[PDB]
PDB file of C-alpha atoms and ligand atoms in Angstrom:
ATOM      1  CA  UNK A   4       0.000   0.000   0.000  1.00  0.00           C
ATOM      2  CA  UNK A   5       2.564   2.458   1.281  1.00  0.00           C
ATOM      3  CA  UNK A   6       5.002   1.964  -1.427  1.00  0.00           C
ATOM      4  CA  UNK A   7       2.657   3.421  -4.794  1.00  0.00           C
ATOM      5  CA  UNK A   8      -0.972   5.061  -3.075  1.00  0.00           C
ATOM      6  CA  UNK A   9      -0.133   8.664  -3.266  1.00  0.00           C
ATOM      7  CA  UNK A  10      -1.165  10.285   0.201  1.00  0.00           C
ATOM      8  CA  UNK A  11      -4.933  11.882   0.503  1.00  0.00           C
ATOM      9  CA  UNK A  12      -5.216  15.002   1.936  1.00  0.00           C
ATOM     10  CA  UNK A  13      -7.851  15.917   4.536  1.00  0.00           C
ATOM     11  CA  UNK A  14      -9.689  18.199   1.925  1.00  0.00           C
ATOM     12  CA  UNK A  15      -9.955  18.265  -2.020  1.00  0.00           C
ATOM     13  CA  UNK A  16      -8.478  21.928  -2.779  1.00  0.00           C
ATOM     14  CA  UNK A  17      -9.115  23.972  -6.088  1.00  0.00           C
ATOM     15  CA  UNK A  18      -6.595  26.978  -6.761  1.00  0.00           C
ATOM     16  CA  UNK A  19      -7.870  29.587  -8.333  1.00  0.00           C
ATOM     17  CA  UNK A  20      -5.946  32.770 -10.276  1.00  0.00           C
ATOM     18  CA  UNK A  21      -6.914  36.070 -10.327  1.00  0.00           C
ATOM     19  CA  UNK A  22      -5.574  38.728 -13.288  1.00  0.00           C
ATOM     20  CA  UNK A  23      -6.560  42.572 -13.064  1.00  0.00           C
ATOM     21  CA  UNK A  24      -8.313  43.174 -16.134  1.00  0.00           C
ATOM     22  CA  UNK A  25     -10.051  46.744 -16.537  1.00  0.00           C
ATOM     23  CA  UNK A  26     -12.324  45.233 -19.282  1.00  0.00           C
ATOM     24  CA  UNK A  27     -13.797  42.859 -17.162  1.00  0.00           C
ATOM     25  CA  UNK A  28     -15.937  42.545 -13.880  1.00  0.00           C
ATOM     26  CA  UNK A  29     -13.936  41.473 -10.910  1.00  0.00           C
ATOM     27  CA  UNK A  30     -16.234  38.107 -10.660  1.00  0.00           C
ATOM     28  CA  UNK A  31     -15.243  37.867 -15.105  1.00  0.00           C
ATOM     29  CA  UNK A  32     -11.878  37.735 -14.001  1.00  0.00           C
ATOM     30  CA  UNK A  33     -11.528  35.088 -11.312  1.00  0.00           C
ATOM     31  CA  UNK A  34     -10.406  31.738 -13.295  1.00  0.00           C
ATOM     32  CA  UNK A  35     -10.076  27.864 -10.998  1.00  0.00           C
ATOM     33  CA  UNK A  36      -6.959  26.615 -12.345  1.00  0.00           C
ATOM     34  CA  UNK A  37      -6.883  23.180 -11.251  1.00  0.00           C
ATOM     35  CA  UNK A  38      -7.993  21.139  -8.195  1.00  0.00           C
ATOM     36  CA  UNK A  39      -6.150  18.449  -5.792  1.00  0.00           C
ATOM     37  CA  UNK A  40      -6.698  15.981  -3.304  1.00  0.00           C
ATOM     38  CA  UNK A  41      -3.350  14.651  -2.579  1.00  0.00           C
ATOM     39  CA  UNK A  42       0.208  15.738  -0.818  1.00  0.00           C
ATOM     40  CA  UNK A  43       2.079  14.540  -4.568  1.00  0.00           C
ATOM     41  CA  UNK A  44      -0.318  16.595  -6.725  1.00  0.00           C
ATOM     42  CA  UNK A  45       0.074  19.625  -4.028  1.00  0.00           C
ATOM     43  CA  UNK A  46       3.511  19.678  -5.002  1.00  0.00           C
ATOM     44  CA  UNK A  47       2.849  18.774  -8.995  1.00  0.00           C
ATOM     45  CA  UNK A  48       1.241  21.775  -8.819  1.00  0.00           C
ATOM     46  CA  UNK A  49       3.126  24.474  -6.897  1.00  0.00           C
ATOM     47  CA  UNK A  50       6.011  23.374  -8.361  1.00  0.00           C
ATOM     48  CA  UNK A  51       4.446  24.151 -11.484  1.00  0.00           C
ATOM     49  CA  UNK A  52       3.069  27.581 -11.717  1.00  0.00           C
ATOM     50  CA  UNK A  53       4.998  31.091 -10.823  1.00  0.00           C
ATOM     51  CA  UNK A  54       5.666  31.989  -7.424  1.00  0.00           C
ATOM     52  CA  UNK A  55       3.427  34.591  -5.929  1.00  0.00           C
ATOM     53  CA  UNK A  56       6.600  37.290  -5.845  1.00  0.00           C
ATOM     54  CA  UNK A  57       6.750  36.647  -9.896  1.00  0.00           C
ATOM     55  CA  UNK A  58       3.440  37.871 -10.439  1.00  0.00           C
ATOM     56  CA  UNK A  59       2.468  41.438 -12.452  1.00  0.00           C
ATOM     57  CA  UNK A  60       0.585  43.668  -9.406  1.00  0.00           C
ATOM     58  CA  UNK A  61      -3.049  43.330  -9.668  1.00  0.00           C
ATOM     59  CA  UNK A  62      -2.967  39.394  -9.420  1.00  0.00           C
ATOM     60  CA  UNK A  63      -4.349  37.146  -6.948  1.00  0.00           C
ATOM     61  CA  UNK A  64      -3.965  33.267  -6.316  1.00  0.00           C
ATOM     62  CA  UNK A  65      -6.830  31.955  -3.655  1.00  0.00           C
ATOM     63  CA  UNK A  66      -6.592  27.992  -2.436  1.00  0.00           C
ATOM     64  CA  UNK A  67      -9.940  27.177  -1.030  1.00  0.00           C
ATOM     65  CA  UNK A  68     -12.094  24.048  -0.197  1.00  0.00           C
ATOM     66  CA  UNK A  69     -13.318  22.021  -3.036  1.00  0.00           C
ATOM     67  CA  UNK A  70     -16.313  23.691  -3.423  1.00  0.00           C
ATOM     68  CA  UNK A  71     -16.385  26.911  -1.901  1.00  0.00           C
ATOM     69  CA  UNK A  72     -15.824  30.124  -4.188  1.00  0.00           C
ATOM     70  CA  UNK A  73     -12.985  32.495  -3.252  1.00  0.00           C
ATOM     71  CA  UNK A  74     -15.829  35.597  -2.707  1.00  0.00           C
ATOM     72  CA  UNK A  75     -17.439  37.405  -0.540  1.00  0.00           C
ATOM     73  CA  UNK A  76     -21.127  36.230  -1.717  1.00  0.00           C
ATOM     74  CA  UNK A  77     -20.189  32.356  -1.321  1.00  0.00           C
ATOM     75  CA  UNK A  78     -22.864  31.233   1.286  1.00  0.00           C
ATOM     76  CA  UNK A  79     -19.372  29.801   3.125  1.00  0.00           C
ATOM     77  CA  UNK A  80     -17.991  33.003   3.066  1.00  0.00           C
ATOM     78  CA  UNK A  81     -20.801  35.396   3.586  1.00  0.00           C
ATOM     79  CA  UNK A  82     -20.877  35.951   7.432  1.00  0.00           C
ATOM     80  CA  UNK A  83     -16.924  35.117   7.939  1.00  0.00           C
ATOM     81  CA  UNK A  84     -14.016  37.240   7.481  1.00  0.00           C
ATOM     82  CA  UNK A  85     -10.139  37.173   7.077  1.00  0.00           C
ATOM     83  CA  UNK A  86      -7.093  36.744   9.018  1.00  0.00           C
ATOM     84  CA  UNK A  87      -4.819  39.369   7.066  1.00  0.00           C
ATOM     85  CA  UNK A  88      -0.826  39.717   6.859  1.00  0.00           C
ATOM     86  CA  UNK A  89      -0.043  42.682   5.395  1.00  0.00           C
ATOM     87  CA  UNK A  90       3.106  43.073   3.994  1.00  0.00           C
ATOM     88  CA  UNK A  91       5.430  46.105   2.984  1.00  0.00           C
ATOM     89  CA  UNK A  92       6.850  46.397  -0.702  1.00  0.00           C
ATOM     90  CA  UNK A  93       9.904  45.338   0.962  1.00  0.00           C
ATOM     91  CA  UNK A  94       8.655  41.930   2.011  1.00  0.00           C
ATOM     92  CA  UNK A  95       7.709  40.831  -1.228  1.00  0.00           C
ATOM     93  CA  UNK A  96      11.302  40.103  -1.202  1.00  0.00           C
ATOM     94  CA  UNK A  97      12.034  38.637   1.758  1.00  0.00           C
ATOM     95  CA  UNK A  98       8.846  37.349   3.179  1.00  0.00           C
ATOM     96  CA  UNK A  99       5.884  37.053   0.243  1.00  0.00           C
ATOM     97  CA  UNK A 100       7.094  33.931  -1.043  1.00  0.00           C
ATOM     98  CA  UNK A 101       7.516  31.810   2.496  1.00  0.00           C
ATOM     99  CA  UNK A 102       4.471  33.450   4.072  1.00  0.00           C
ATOM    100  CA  UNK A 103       2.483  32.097   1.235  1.00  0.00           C
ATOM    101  CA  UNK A 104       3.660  28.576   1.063  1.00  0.00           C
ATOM    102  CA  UNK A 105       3.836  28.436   5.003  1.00  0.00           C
ATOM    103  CA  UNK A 106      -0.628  29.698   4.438  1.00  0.00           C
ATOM    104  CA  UNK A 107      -0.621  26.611   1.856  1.00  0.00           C
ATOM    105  CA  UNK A 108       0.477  24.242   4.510  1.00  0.00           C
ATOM    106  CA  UNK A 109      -1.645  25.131   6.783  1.00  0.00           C
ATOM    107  CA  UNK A 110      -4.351  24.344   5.018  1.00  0.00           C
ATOM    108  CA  UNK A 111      -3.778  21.592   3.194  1.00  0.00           C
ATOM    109  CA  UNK A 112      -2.553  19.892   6.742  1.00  0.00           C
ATOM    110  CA  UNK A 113      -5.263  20.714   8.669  1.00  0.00           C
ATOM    111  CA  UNK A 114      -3.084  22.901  10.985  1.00  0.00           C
ATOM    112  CA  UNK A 115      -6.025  24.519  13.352  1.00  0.00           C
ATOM    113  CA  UNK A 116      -6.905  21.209  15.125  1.00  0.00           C
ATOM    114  CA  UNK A 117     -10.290  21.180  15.490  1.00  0.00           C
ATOM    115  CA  UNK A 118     -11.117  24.856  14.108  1.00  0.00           C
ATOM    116  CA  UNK A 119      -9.812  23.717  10.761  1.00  0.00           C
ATOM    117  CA  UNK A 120     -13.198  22.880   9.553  1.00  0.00           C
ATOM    118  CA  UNK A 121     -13.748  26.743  10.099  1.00  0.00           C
ATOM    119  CA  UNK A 122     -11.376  27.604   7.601  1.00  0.00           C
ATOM    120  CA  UNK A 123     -12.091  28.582   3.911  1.00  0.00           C
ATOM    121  CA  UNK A 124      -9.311  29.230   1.973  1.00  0.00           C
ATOM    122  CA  UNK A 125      -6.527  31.718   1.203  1.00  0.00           C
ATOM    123  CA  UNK A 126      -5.727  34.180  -0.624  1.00  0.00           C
ATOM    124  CA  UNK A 127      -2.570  36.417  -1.605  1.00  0.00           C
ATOM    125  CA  UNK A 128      -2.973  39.942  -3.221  1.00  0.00           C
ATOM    126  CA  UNK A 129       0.535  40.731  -4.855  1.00  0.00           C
ATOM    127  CA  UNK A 130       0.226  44.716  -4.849  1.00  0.00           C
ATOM    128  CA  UNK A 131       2.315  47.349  -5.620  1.00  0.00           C
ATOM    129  CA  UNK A 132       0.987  49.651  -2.440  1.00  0.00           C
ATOM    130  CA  UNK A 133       1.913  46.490  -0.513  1.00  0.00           C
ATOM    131  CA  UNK A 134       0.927  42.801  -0.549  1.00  0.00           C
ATOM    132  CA  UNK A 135      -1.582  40.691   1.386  1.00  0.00           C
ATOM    133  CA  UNK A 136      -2.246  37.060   2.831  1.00  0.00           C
ATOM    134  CA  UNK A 137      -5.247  36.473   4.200  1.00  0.00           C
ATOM    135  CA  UNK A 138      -7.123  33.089   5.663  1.00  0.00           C
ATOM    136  CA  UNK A 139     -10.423  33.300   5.444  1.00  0.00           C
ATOM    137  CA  UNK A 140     -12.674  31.223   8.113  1.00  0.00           C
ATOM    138  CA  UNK A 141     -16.690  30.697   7.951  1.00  0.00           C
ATOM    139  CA  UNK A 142     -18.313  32.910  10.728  1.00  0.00           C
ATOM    140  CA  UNK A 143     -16.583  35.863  12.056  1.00  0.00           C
ATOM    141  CA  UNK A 144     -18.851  35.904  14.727  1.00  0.00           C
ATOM    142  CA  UNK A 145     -17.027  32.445  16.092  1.00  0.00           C
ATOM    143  CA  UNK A 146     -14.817  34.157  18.626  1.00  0.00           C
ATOM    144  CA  UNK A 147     -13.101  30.887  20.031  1.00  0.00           C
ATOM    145  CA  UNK A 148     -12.572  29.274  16.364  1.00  0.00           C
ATOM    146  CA  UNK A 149     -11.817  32.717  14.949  1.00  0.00           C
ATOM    147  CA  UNK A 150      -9.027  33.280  17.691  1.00  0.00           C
ATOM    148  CA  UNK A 151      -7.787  29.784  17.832  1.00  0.00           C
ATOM    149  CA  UNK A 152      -6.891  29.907  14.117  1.00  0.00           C
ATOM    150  CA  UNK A 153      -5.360  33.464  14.314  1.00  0.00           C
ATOM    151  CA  UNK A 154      -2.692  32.343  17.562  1.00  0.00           C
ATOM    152  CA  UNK A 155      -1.818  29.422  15.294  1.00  0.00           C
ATOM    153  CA  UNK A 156      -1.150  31.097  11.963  1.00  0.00           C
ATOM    154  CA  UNK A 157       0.543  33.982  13.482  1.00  0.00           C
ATOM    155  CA  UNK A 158       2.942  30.939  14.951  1.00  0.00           C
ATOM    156  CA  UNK A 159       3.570  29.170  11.971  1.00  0.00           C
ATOM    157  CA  UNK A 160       4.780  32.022   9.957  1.00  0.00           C
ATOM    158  CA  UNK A 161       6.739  33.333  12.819  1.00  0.00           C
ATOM    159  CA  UNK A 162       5.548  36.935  13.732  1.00  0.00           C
ATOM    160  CA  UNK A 163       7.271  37.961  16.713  1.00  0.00           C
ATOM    161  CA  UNK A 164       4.888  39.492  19.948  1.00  0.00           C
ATOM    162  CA  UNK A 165       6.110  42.732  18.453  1.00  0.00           C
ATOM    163  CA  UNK A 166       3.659  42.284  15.880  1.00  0.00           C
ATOM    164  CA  UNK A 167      -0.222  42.220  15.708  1.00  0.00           C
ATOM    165  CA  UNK A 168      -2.531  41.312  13.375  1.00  0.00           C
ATOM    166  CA  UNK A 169      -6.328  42.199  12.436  1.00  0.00           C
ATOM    167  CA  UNK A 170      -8.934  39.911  12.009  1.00  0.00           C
ATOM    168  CA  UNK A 171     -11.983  41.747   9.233  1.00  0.00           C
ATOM    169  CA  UNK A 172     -15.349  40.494   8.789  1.00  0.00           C
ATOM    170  CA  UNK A 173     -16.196  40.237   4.933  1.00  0.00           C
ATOM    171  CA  UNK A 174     -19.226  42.170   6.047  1.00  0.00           C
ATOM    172  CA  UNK A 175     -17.085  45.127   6.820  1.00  0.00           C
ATOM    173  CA  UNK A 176     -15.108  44.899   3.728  1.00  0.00           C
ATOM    174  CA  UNK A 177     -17.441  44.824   1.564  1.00  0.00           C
ATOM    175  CA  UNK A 178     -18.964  48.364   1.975  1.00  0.00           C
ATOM    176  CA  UNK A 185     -12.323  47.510  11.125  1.00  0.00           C
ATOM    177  CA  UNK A 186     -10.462  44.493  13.246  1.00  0.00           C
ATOM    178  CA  UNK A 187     -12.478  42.075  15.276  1.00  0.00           C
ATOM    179  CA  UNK A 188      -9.974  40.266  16.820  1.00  0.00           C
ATOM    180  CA  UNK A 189      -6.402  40.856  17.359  1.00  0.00           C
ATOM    181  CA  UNK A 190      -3.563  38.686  18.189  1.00  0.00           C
TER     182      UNK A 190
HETATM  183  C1  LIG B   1     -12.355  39.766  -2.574  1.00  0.00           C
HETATM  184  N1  LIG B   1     -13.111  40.669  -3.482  1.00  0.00           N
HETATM  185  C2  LIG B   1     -12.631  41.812  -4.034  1.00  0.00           C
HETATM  186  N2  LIG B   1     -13.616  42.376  -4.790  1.00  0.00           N
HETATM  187  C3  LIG B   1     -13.560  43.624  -5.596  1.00  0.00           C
HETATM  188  O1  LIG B   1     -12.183  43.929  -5.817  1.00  0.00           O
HETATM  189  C4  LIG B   1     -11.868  45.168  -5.195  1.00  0.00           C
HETATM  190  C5  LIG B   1     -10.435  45.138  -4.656  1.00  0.00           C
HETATM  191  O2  LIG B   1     -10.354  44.257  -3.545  1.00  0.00           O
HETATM  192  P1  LIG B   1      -9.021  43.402  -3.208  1.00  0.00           P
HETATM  193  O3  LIG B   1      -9.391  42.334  -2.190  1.00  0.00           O
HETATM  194  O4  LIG B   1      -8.492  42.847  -4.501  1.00  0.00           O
HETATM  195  O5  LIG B   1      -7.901  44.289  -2.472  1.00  0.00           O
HETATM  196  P2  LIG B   1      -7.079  45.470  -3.180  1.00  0.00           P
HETATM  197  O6  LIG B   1      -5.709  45.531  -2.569  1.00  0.00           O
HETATM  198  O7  LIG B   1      -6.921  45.253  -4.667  1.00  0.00           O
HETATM  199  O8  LIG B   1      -7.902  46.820  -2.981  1.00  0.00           O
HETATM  200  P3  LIG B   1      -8.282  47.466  -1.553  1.00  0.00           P
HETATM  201  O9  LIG B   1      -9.787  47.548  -1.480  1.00  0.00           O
HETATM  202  O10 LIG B   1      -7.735  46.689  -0.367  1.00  0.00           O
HETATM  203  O11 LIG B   1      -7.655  48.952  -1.568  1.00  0.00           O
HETATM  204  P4  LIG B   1      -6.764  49.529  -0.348  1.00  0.00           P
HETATM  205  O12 LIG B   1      -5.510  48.714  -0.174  1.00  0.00           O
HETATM  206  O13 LIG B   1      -7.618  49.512   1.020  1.00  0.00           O
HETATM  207  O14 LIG B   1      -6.404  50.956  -0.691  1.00  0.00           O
HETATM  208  C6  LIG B   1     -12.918  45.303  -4.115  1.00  0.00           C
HETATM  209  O15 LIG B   1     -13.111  46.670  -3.757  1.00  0.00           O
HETATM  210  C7  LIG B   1     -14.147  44.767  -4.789  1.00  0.00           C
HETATM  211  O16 LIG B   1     -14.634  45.769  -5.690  1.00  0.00           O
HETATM  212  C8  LIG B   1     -14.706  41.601  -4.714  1.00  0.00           C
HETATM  213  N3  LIG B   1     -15.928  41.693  -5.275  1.00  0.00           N
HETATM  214  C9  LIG B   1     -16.844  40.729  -5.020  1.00  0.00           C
HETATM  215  N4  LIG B   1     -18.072  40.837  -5.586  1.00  0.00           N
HETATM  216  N5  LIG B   1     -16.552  39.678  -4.208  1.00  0.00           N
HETATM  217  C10 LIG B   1     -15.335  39.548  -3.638  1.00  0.00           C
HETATM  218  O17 LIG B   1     -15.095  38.500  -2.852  1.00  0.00           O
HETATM  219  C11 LIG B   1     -14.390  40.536  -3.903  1.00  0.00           C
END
């Protein structure tokens, strides 16, 4: 068994790609690239396509559950909100790039222990007036779930106590922090 089953992730994950095109609605311009249920077609994949730091500003990529549209108006995503890293235009350099594949890990490993099922997706915003990760979790309103997931994530990509970060309803952004850790 061991020796040629590749190994099943927790979720099936679809990555999606987002390109700034003035032509288009923002919705027209959302695209899924390709979806994965294993650790060996993770890596097929990322290993694959440009890092995030490679990208022309005004690009997104979003990983998010099989199933569940990186927007605002998915019923998943409606009344839940974002766990956001935001970067300077320095740190595209230095810390884009890890950040991001340090946010792919922990979703694809189920890093919140039970609060995982609360998560979404992710998404990074590669920006020229600075770039973004964000996880995005159901309900904003779950304050133990919500808070779990944000002492975890800060963790994992290493913030030091001198930092804090917000957590935003997508409520709020669509027309603020919640939580802080
Ligand atoms: C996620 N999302 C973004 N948009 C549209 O795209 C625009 C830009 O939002 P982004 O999340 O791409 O963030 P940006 O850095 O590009 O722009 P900022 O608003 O943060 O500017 P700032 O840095 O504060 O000066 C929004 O204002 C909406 O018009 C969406 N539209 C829908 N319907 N659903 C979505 O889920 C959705």
């Amino acid at each position: 068994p061991e020796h040629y089953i590749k190994h099943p992730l927790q979720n099936r994950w679809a990555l999606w790609f987002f390109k700034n095109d003035k032509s288009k609605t923002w919705q027209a311009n959302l695209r899924l690239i390709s979806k994965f249920d294993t650790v060996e077609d993770f890596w097929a994949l990322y290993n694959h396509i440009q890092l995030s730091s490679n990208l022309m500003p005004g690009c997104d990529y979003s990983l998010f559950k099989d199933g569940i549209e990186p927007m605002w108006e998915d019923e998943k995503n409606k009344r839940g909100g974002r766990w956001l890293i935001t970067l300077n235009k320095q740190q595209r350099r230095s810390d884009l790039d890890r950040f991001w594949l340090e946010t792919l890990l922990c979703l694809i490993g189920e890093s919140f222990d039970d609060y995982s099922d609360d998560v979404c997706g992710a998404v990074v915003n590669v920006r020229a007036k600075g770039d973004k990760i964000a996880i995005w979790t159901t309900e904003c309103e779950n304050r133990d779930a919500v808070t779990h997931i944000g002492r975890v994530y800060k963790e994992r990509l290493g913030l030091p106590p001198k930092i804090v970060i917000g957590y935003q309803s997508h409520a709020d952004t669509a027309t603020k922090n919640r939580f802080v850790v």
